[PDB]
Amino acid sequence: IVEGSDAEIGMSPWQVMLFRKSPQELLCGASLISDRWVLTAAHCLLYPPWDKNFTENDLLVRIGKHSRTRYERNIEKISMLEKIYIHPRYNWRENLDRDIALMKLKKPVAFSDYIHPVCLPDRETAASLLQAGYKGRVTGWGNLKETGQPSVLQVVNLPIVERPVCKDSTRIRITDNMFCAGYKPDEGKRGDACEGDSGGPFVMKSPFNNRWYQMGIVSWGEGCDRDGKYGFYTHVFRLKKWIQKVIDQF
């Protein structure tokens, strides 16, 4: 996260760290959506251009964390994966269209002050809140600048950007399964996700029922926090029929 701040304790209790077993290293962010299901970006698990194709046994999820590198005894909980599900039309060949994956845990995680699921949006909440200018919140342990790493979880609030501005900022083909967020060069304020924040959540607090909803997944960007560029996020509601099919069948 570029130009963010340290998270408060318990500020993002749905935050999940995707952790490689050997070598032990951070792979990605992710989010807790129930006691047994974790949401992330497909490219965190499968990206053939970089020879990335993880299996369940390669990976752990660490839930309840604040510190990036510490083992947070009596606070964090570490879970093994039962099964990975990648969207069948995830487009890793071109533009990361439908950049979404689910991970089912081997055993349910115990909720606590530090561990709690985020809501997924209904159609009405998505329609009301996914508007240009409305701000969401992105969290992660990724790079603090494009070209080190944070001591603790980072947080930045960013406005959703008009779709023509998103399209005109890049040569990559945008789709309806994406939205972009960030400040414009004139707006003064800054901030973005960066490498290592992949798969983490873009959340919004509904003013109707005061619950946090996950509207997006950190997907891609060209650099980090560049003027005239914007971060791109998987449009969670657009893919919710696939989410519900996986969870209902598995």
Binding site: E25, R62, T69, Y71, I78, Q149
Partner: peptide
């Protein structure tokens, strides 16, 4: 760079 996690998870 990371603190070793308990062996039971590995």
């Amino acid at each position: 760079d990371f603190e070793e996690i308990p062996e039971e998870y590995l």
